[PDB]
Amino acid sequence: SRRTYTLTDYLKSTFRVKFYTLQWISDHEYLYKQENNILLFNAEYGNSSIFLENSTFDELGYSTNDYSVSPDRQFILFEYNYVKQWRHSYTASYDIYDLNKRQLITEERIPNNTQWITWSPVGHKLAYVWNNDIYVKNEPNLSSQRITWTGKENVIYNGVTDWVYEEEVFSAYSALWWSPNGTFLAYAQFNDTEVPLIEYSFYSDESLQYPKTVRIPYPKAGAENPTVKFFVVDTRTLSPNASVTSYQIVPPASVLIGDHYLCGVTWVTEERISLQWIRRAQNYSIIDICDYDESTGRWISSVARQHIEISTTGWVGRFRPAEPHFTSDGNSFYKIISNEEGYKHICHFQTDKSNCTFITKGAWEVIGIEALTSDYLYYISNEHKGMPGGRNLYRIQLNDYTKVTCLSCELNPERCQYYSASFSNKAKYYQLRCFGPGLPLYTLHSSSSDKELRVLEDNSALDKMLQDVQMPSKKLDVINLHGTKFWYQMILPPHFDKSKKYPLLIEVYAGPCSQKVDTVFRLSWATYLASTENIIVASFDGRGSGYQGDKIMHAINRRLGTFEVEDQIEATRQFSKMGFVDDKRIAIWGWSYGGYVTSMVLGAGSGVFKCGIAVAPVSKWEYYDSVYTERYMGLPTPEDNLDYYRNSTVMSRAENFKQVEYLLIHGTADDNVHFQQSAQLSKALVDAGVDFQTMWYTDEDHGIASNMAHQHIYTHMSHFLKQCFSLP
């Protein structure tokens, strides 16, 4: 050791962090890909048997990037020819392989350019989306039956989301939900007819003589939104000479009354489905539990089965309302909602009663419900040690809320404080995934006695490599702001010399319900900055941040660009007091919402920051999408919140940029935060006579994620920072 973690190490991922991905297929069995082949591991004993030999991969077309085995284990889908679209959406080609006959299905194949495909929950039916229309295949070798005929590029989407539902509502491209036993196929249809189009140039390969213009129906704040229709198809009658039997379920009257969004769909039993709707304002949601009427095929709703959730001080949920988790019988459900104290906790609801009963409580929050059995409820929370940036698995007895045990807290306390879990079909077994503060660790456990069972991946290899590099140390702590304790973290350079003044880089996100301070282990750009360049990188979660109750999260309601920006400045000011920080060399950077906050901070005229870098920042809320923007800002009209939309633009702070060195970066093909945002920001700075630097990235999107652009952007930002900090 006498070498550090370099920029090249980060960019080339020279130090590999291993993981362990598996797919549960029963209550005690899971599939795992080891050396290209799919093995069938038995959780209980660990006796692994080959389920699908490697080499059986004849590089069909390209390379199989994913597989899915039908529930009855008779077939397996091979996904290849992956073509990305937005954040979650993509199209791909699919091959169906018969596990019995061990033959490739060669007739009635899945179309090229398939948008979404899924096996039914039992058996082996298939439902897929192609050219915006839904198709169902009862048997892999049999021809598919067309379900919808209205699909139309950029207009009508059946079974898949449009741009805004994908990014802001579902966080998924799929909008198809098979019923438990495959009798019914539920789907949503999105109509973007009246949604304005964002248009931008895409240059493509150097050989393309004329650039292409990309057009996407994208509703900006206050614009016309897509409309949605939810249908339940009875697949029993699907036949070439038969029409489709379907029923449209509409939201309850209190939501149907105005613009709204469908935000959740949960099958309860084969004859009961739970739909969660939310008004466009997003401070009023309702769960509607509909029952199938065997005599008419209708799905009936009743006021007794409706559950309302509202927020008078903000929006419902973290990014959307939490999903209900029903009991096997469907007579009750558990769901995370805000406490009387503003903390998100699990409440128990009777399907036909309006009052619920909280089963957890405290100045901490449940992150999510992971599994439910007739006797226990497993959930993730940040209760342990009172640190909101930590995560642990817990089990609570359904007939005695006094009985709650933490399953992961003590397994490896110093190496593991941030966990996620994956349960087998009947919660009989669960994989624990520890992400930090130590090297990631994957383990298998049995719910019986919570026995450690075995280690799946401990990253021993990475550990060996790292003991030879001067790694920086990551510390978390708290600071007081306006009478409130907030968390921060600092990545400190190795062989830290307290007698020296180190330049400081604040990495910020700060969007509503964000969390930049946690105990997750990361080999990041910051690791390089601290290890090789001796720069301290700090992050702070202030007002508007999440997992600490609504009082803190809702503080920025209807006022984005205010308290979260001010808190970054105030916190940095506190950090600057430390004798080991060179207060004359403090920078700030961020991506997306973080680019916005970085810019707002730099335009605050605080005198605290010397320079900063904003990557793909929002610059004006009217330019961002309706769903996200309106959830936090209401509408941009004088009758509502136009005044706060107007004085929260970065452009309104243009003059103050004369005091700092600024680097504005943006991908020209960003379909999310449009290049427009940075183009308008640069124009305002030019108008104000302010000098600054820019870097556009041709054809890169919101992630500036291509291999060469990824390397180029961090290399460019690194040079900008060294220049700002007078570092050789």
Ligand X SMILES: *[C@@H]1O[C@H](CO)[C@@H](O[C@@H]2O[C@H](CO)[C@@H](O)[C@H](O)[C@H]2NC(C)=O)[C@H](O)[C@H]1NC(C)=O
Ligand Y SMILES: *[C@@H]1O[C@H](CO)[C@@H](O[C@@H]2O[C@H](CO)[C@@H](O[C@@H]3O[C@H](CO)[C@@H](O)[C@H](O)[C@@H]3O)[C@H](O)[C@H]2NC(C)=O)[C@H](O)[C@H]1NC(C)=O
Q: Active-site residue numbers?
A: 592, 670, 702
Phi, psi of 35 (to 5 degrees): 65, 50
Residue (of 94, 102, 107, 138) closest to 120 by Cα position: 138
If one asks whether residue 725 binds a copy of itself (CB under 8 A), the answer comes out as: no
Size of the site for a copy of itself (CB under 8 A): 47
Q: Which residues in the 208-227 window bind a copy of itself by CB under 8 A?
A: 209-211, 213, 220-221, 223
DSSP β-bridge partners for residue 292: 299
From CA 489, how far away is CA 475, in angstroms rounded? 5
If one asks whether residue 205 binds ligand Y (CB under 6 A), the answer comes out as: no
If one asks whether residue 17 binds a copy of itself (CB under 8 A), the answer comes out as: no
Task: Work out what residue 37 binds among ligand X, a copy of itself, ligand Y, none; the CB cut-off runs from 5 to 8 Å by kind.
Answer: ligand Y
- Asked if residues 368 and 389 have their Cβ atoms less than 8 Å apart, the reply is no
Phi, psi of 704 (to 5 degrees): 40, 50
Cβ proximity to ligand X: between 334 and 628 the closer is 628
Q: Identify the H or E element spanning 642.
A: helix 642-646
| Nearest distance from C-beta of residue 96 to ligand NAG, angstroms | 21
Q: Which residues in the 32-51 window bind ligand NAG by CB under 6 A?
A: 35-37, 40, 42, 45, 47-49
From CA 330, how far away is CA 332, in angstroms rounded? 6
Cβ proximity to ligand Y: between 18 and 28 the closer is 18
Cβ proximity to ligand NAG: between 55 and 707 the closer is 55
Distance of CA 580 to the CA centre of its chain: 36
Task: Work out what residue 562 binds among a copy of itself, ligand X, ligand NAG, none; the CB cut-off runs from 5 to 8 Å by kind.
Answer: ligand X
Q: What three-state secondary structure class fits 272? A: strand
- Asked if residues 429 and 416 have their Cβ atoms less than 8 Å apart, the reply is no
| Surface-to-core class of residue 275, CB atoms within 10 Å of its CB (0-12 exposed, 13-18 middle, 19+ buried) | buried
As given in the structure block, the two tokens for residue 393 are 């698995």
Residues with Cβ within 8 Å of 433's Cβ and at least 6 positions away in sequence, in order, are 19, 20, 419, 420, 421, 422, 440, 442
Q: Which residues in the 191-220 window bind ligand NAG by CB under 6 A?
A: 191, 193-194
Give the N- to C-terminal CA distance of the chain in Å, as an integer: 22
| Nearest distance from C-beta of residue 559 to ligand X, angstroms | 7
Q: Which of 8, 14, 48, 54 binds ligand Y (CB under 6 A)?
A: 54
Q: Which of 54, 213, 647, 715 binds ligand NAG (CB under 6 A)?
A: 54
If one asks whether residue 699 binds a copy of itself (CB under 8 A), the answer comes out as: yes
Q: Which residues in the 16-45 window bind ligand Y by CB under 6 A?
A: 35-37
Phi, psi of 591 (to 5 degrees): -120, 140
| Nearest distance from C-beta of residue 28 to ligand Y, angstroms | 24
If one asks whether residue 143 binds ligand Y (CB under 6 A), the answer comes out as: no
| Nearest distance from C-beta of residue 689 to a copy of itself, angstroms | 7
Task: Work out what residue 634 binds among a copy of itself, ligand NAG, ligand X, none; the CB cut-off runs from 5 to 8 Å by kind.
Answer: ligand NAG
Cβ proximity to ligand Y: between 61 and 196 the closer is 61
How many Cα atoms within 13 Å fall on the side-chain side of residue 80?
12
What is the CB neighbour count within 10 angstroms for residue 529?
28
Q: Each residue of 334-373: b (16+ CB within 10 Å) or e?
A: bbbbbbeebbbbbbbbebeeeebeebbeeebbbbbbbbbb
Q: Identify the H or E element spanning 503.
A: strand 502-507
From CA 640, how far away is CA 643, in angstroms rounded? 8
Cβ proximity to ligand X: between 564 and 625 the closer is 564
If one asks whether residue 373 binds ligand Y (CB under 6 A), the answer comes out as: no
DSSP assignment of 70-104: -TTSSEEEEEEEEEE-SSS-EEEEEEEEETTTTEE
| Nearest distance from C-beta of residue 29 to ligand NAG, angstroms | 6
Site string for ligand X, 610-649 (x = CB under 6 A): -------------------------------------xx-
- Alpha-carbon radius of gyration of the chain: 26
Task: Work out what residue 156 binds among ligand Y, ligand NAG, a copy of itself, none; the CB cut-off runs from 5 to 8 Å by kind.
Answer: ligand NAG
If one asks whether residue 23 binds ligand NAG (CB under 6 A), the answer comes out as: no
Q: Which of 695, 703, 722, 727 binds a copy of itself (CB under 8 A)?
A: 695
Task: Work out what residue 676 binds among ligand Y, ligand NAG, a copy of itself, none; the CB cut-off runs from 5 to 8 Å by kind.
Answer: a copy of itself
- Asked if residues 309 and 277 have their Cβ atoms less than 8 Å apart, the reply is no
If one asks whether residue 448 binds ligand X (CB under 6 A), the answer comes out as: no
Site string for ligand NAG, 140-169 (x = CB under 6 A): ----------x-----x-------------
DSSP β-bridge partners for residue 614: 590, 664
If one asks whether residue 568 binds ligand X (CB under 6 A), the answer comes out as: no
From CA 700, how far away is CA 666, in angstroms rounded? 8
If one asks whether residue 284 binds ligand NAG (CB under 6 A), the answer comes out as: yes
One-letter amino acid at 94 equals Y
Question: What is the maximum span of the chain, computed from C-alpha positions, in angstroms?
Answer: 84
If one asks whether residue 191 binds ligand X (CB under 6 A), the answer comes out as: yes
Task: Work out what residue 519 binds among ligand Y, ligand X, ligand NAG, none; the CB cut-off runs from 5 to 8 Å by kind.
Answer: none
If one asks whether residue 321 binds ligand X (CB under 6 A), the answer comes out as: no
If one asks whether residue 281 binds ligand NAG (CB under 6 A), the answer comes out as: yes
Residue (of 418, 422, 420) closest to 430 by Cα position: 422
Cβ proximity to ligand X: between 64 and 599 the closer is 599
Window contacting ligand X (CB under 6 A); options: 63-71, 189-197, 356-364, 591-599: 189-197
Window contacting ligand NAG (CB under 6 A); options: 168-176, 233-241, 419-427, 611-619: 233-241
If one asks whether residue 59 binds ligand Y (CB under 6 A), the answer comes out as: no
From CA 593, how far away is CA 541, in angstroms rounded? 13
Helix, strand, coil share (%) of the chain residues, nearest 5: 20, 40, 45
Strands 245-249 and 133-137: unpaired
Q: Which residues in the 565-604 window bind ligand NAG by CB under 6 A?
A: none
| Nearest distance from C-beta of residue 687 to a copy of itself, angstroms | 5
Instruction: Summarize as ranges the residues that interact with ligand Y (CB under 6 A).
Output: 35-37, 54
Instruction: Summarize as ranges the residues that interact with ligand NAG (CB under 6 A).
Output: 35-37, 40, 42, 45, 47-49, 54-55, 150, 156, 191, 193-194, 239-241, 281, 283-284, 310, 312, 634, 640
Instruction: Summarize as ranges the residues that interact with a copy of itself (CB under 8 A).
Output: 196-201, 203, 206, 209-211, 213, 220-221, 223, 620, 622-623, 649, 651, 668, 674-676, 679-680, 682-684, 686-687, 689, 691, 693-699, 708-709, 711-712, 715-716, 719
